[PDB]
């Protein structure tokens, strides 16, 4: 579309969600009113509107359409602000939408670049390397009223490595396509893969620039080092340090239960103040080798996740915990900055 267009887009009715650009939502449309829309959509723009509930949301574009009922799969693309809402008789809802802004900015030193220096800006393809990176990319900081290290705090490529390095303390694993190269894309991945609650998510989606959004996500990863029960708010479950990745998968992948319920499940070494419900089992144990025991807040008995315990004696770790993103609330043991 256009970064600040006013477009109209149909709303998947009962669907309710925060959709981060670049997330896929699987949908099964059976009510007849709905399947009609999907039909029109897929013949036309193939994009509907996922609302935040609230005057915000994301557009979702369809990349998979199978009629059995209509079964679809959409990717999130653009964030918007609701302007109007036609709740037509059919039961579907049309929406006047303002596309929120993805400001893309040049390098900080682009304007202050000394012509003579322009033929050194291409660099030839580790602490020392990034020390030189900053000494060379921001050399022309001497022409301004600010120092080099300040400009690094707004330099997309630095911000991103800063984020990678932390994310690696959670998953000694990949470092290549593992994460995107476009600040915008990378910014959006981080948001959907941090252990944050929907409000934090909504903040990042309301941020206008990929640079401001990376700075934010960094602030989240540096200040909200404690994860509490979202429901009673008075129970610290686990701390940033205890995050790890059981397999390549990652530290909070999405797993499916025998009933299609999905669970972004952050694996942590130790959790606290949790009561265990029942006897361990192994059915559909997402982590083959350990058994699961349901876990809940000792104060409000809200579901937090499971406790995985090793069947064998070889395996390490012997115990760990899986906590589902929707139960958790990040907390600062002070605001988040742009």
């Amino acid at each position: 579309h256009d970064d600040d267009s006013c477009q109209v887009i149909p709303v998947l009715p009962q669907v309710m969600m925060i959709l981060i650009p670049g997330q896929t939502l699987p949908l099964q449309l059976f009510h007849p009113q709905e399947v009609s829309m999907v039909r029109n959509l897929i013949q036309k723009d193939r994009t509907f509107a996922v609302l935040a509930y609230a005057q915000f949301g994301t557009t979702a574009e369809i990349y998979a359409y199978r009629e059995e009922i209509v079964k679809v799969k959409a990717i999130g693309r653009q964030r918007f602000k609701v302007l109007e809402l036609r709740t037509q008789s059919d039961g579907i809802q049309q929406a006047k939408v303002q596309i929120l802004p993805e400001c893309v900015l040049p390098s900080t030193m682009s304007a202050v670049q000394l012509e003579s220096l322009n033929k050194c800006q291409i660099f030839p393809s580790s602490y020392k390397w990034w020390q030189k990176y900053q000494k060379r990319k921001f050399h022309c900081a001497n022409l301004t009223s600010w120092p080099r290290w300040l400009y690094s705090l707004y330099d997309a490529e630095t911000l991103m490595d800063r984020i990678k390095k932390q994310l690696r303390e959670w998953d000694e694993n990949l470092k290549d396509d593992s994460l995107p190269s476009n600040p915008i894309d990378f910014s959006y991945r981080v948001a959907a893969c941090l252990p944050i609650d929907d409000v934090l998510r909504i903040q990042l989606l309301k941020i206008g620039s990929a640079i401001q959004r990376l700075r934010c996500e960094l602030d989240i990863m540096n200040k909200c080092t404690s994860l509490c029960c979202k429901q009673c708010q008075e129970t610290e479950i686990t701390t940033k340090n205890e995050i790890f990745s059981l397999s390549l998968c990652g530290p909070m992948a999405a797993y499916v239960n025998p009933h299609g319920y999905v669970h972004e499940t952050l694996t942590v070494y130790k959790a606290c103040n949790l009561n265990l419900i029942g006897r361990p089992s192994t059915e559909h144990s997402w982590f083959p080798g350990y058994a699961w025991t349901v876990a809940q807040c000792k104060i409000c008995a809200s579901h937090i996740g499971w406790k995985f315990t090793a069947t064998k004696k070889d395996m390490s770790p012997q115990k760990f915990w899986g906590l589902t993103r929707s139960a958790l609330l990040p907390t600062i043991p002070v605001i988040l900055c742009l």
Binding site: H259, Y261, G278, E283, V294, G305, W306
Partner: peptide, 26 residues
């Protein structure tokens, strides 16, 4: 069967136990 949670997979002795659990999800 009647006493397992569809969402987290918990199993109660009783089909009331299961409803008081269903709250804690909503």
């Amino acid at each position: 069967s009647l006493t397992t949670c569809e969402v987290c997979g918990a199993c109660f002795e009783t089909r009331k136990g299961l409803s008081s659990h269903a709250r804690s999800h909503l």
